[PDB]
Symmetry: D2
Subunit: 231 residues, 4 copies
């Protein structure tokens, strides 16, 4: 229905959200954005993108929230080519001081949210036989993370979920990938934050959005089921 490709940025209030939208607009995408600010909307429109804001669902807490975002792309543009989300709030503390309630808390943010996003977006894309999905996550799930054992465990489920979804839809030509970043390990999202990461360097939000475009901008279609640790 729409000649221009359509990208869904699930949340544009925080972290790399605004910069993803900027990169998408630079590459000729129209946009469905979770709770964008008025100045962000005007800025993207000055870059030539048509913007459809979706308000009130950027936390992706329910199956309905993700479906509302996917439905907004279909109603406005009739297509959904790219979709990206980030989620999850770190909880720290030794395993022997932890509680089952904390485990459920991180499971909700780290697993239920990517699950809901992909459950809504993947069927839209498989029917069109094209699509790129990026799940932005932590790298804590790749290996034991001292001080965040519960968080590391559920992040591992999220990455394996992405790999399972990708394997199931690989024949469709839909791509599903995950990128892990230290941006997701700090509740804010700089001196104190950098001191927690090994090399003491995060890079810029703009650089992060540029890297993410390798999995979202339509320039190549054969990477799927990958987890990449960024920076």
């Amino acid at each position: 229905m729409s000649n221009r490709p359509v990208a869904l940025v699930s949340d544009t209030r925080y972290m790399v959200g605004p910069d993803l939208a900027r990169r998408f607009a630079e590459k000729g995408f129209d946009l469905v954005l979770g709770d964008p600010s008025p100045n962000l909307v005007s800025e993207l429109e000055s870059m030539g993108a048509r913007i459809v804001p979706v308000t009130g669902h950027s936390d992706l807490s329910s199956p309905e929230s993700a479906q509302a975002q996917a439905d907004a792309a279909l109603s406005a543009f009739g297509r959904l080519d790219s979709a990206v989300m980030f989620s999850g709030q770190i909880v720290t503390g030794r395993f022997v001081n932890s509680t089952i309630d904390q485990l459920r808390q991180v499971f909700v943010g780290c697993v239920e949210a990517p699950y809901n996003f992909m459950r809504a977006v993947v069927p839209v894309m498989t029917e069109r036989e094209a699509g790129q999905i990026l799940i932005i996550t932590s790298a804590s799930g790749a290996r034991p993370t001292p001080g965040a054992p519960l968080y590391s465990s559920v992040r591992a489920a999220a990455t394996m979920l992405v790999k399972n979804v990708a394997d199931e839809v690989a024949r469709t030509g839909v791509q599903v990938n995950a990128v892990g970043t230290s941006f997701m390990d700090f509740p804010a999202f700089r001196a104190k934050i950098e001191s927690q990461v090994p090399m003491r360097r995060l890079g810029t939000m703009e650089e992060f959005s540029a890297f993410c475009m390798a999995f979202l901008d339509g320039s190549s279609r054969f990477t799927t089921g990958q987890f990449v640790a960024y920076a």
Copy 2:
């Protein structure tokens, strides 16, 4: 005195055989819901048996704590602890529901969490212990037909590795064995697990095409539970005919 082993569930699958292997090696036992026949057989092998009834599902922190407390109350020590858990749910991801995801998370992650949350503090206090979490091998790689189950099984294995890393300095070992024996139908007793029609469905999914007996499986588990070797920790070992 005799070393003490907790077998969280002896109602199904490899539960009884784990108890047998421990009893053969001179362990006293805390067992979840053992049948009278199993108790008498284990007592003839020389083990003193402490049954814990009603907590074998590990559905609550209180259930796991009850099993750990029974070891301390009866024997004053807890040397080895093993549990198995989780029920496979099948179906393609695009047809799945959030409730199914939550369902498999409870059996595959919450149950091992509760078990280790109770058992690990007991063992670090004594500066010695072997814990084995028996799980599926589905978490190792994408599993066609069980994507949600595979995802949460991966959380369970990473949880084990995180716990193992945290307590590695304490002398406590925490390992995971993933097996197709965990992908069987639910609530299967010994005769059902050994039924040839049931076995053929699982054996067809492993590259070795054969699972072996549960007795052989329990013998392999003793390498992580019988006290014969120490320090190996944070390992995920597949006993699944080569699937992982």
Copy 3:
């Protein structure tokens, strides 16, 4: 040094080599190229790139060939910002019918060649505290590959070598990554080169020690 970034494409005779050069020329790089054709050189110069052809060293069979390519970048431009190679030829057959000669053969192309490339390029980049290296390989090393057991094994050594090198030079800001593709053993070469630019075009830093499979 030159004020323009410099990319080394180790072999432009086959596969994605020419398209990698095209992407670099579009993105503001000057180029050091292994054995380019006259037509490729002329095309790239029409795109505004300065080209330094290196003749005879694209096999990376010796440390000296890899060093010659790195040395050519420094002599012409005084800098080397990006470096990419591909190597390895699939060897098939059941393990029980294989020979030690085949194992040694696959090790040369899959491991010795990336070793030689990184041994030459990494010291040049660590001195400048900046650089992006991409090793293009197979995806066979990630898991057992039926019919190619020896090839799969040495490919795993190549990926672990990339990870070890990346860890070693991470403090300098140099990035070292691997992309594994069935091209080494679909879509267009142009699409594949576009993906490779995420690890080579300077648009983001720090990402290092990653193995990404490009199906």
Copy 4:
């Protein structure tokens, strides 16, 4: 042709070699041993195990050395049920100071030796439709090792080779596994006897349905 199960311990001169043979003799195995000392032979014979010494081939440097050890089991007993080897010597130094000759050197000990062993033993076991092979290695392959980057890279090839061999022959009933130990890194650890007891889980016939596994045993450096 011989009733007792038969185990090949490729090298009994160093490390866990002797303790592996002791465990096998305790489990009722007859033994083919690489360069056993006279005291070791007598001790194992006192355990009841029949012992066939193989001299001069324990380095597994050539395909013929590995084949000779497998041939010795078949000639003496007509069967080969279990086979275990260890190999490889750490090389240390920064990657930027390393040489291609060092890479080739570690490849020989870490990859060529297990290759030769498996290439000789696997066909013996597959014809039988039964067998257990254990490759004892380092855990350096699993993750980058800053001290020994070349060594870590080739150890990863050794573990992937084991996984590929296991996958190829999984249907035959032959199992092939790898155990990594810091005992392999010399120029907590636990005792050698404890290590050999753990190794029996993949070699004593008590379980036969695990293949393609890499297990890091113990910890320490």
